[PDB]
Amino acid sequence: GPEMVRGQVFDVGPRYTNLSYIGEGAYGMVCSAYDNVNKVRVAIKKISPFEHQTYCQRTLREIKILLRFRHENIIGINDIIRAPTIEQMKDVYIVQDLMETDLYKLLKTQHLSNDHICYFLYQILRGLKYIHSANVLHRDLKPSNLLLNTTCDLKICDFGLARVADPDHDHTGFLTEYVATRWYRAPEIMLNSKGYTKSIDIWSVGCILAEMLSNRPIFPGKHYLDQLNHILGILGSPSQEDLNCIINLKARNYLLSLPHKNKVPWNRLFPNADSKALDLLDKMLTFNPHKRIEVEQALAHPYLEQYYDPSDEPIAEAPFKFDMELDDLPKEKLKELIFEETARFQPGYRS
């Protein structure tokens, strides 16, 4: 019999043993384990997606994306385990190198020095540069998705909400609504809910920077509509120009209804922060996504000048294109694609 963790079977032996619980979601569980073959500690995610089309879609995306990606600040896939025939495949197990902690945990236990904050931010943006150069949007950056070892190496994880958006094509009206985790959610996810861009990831990074500076989330909305109020309580009411940019009439009128709010200066919120950090914070937390700093310009900001080196910041060799996006398909078809995508890890595979 295979090992079992909190009632879930983890059919991953004999290679992977000594499973310990780490966490879960709606259709899976993550455990730590020991790889007896390579003699390394791993994290193993069990996914059981095949009954729901949206779970299948996200599983395929995460797999396709992470199997192409290779970057020091992004967690790689070491192995994928699943059944030898499509009919027996109910679960998929993804294996990664085990990291020691994550930023969410670290921020519960430790006040970070400015030097730590600066280096972590550099690593997040260096990883993001690579992700955005591939035409991928992460869409769920937050502290618990940033893994760390005690050597201060940072890696971005969780591509379960990530997708490709080929910039040759206007995706306005075609992106999934209600992405990101609420506190890290850019205002245009609420106001241009089907037409946002990779700029949402910069917003989330700004939220993360704010959180490193104070060990608390900057915009802790209690519900979807309160989120936008939290944002505007600090940024203040948008300029008329920024309102006049909002293409969606219902959204623009909804903002016109709201009472006026003044800008809270960054240095009253963060009176002990490095001034340059606050400058970069302001640029990342810019209301208008077309005025918000892009990842390359953020890396070039004075705050990160001791680390910025475009000769050592890889970009994707083969950015993903519109081909990698037509996954709006029946769940049974997505299962076939997941089976094909994971075939290279099976005994007897041939291309």
């Binding site: 020091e72 600040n73 670290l106 430790q110 030097d115 730590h116 280096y119 690593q123 005690t150 050597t151 201060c152 190496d153 001791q306 680390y307 080196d309 050592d312």
Partner: peptide, 14 residues
């Protein structure tokens, strides 16, 4: 318990 930044390989290169 978090080590100095210079224990990171990436930082050593910089």
């Amino acid at each position: 318990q978090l080590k100095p930044i210079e224990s990171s390989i990436l930082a050593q290169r910089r």
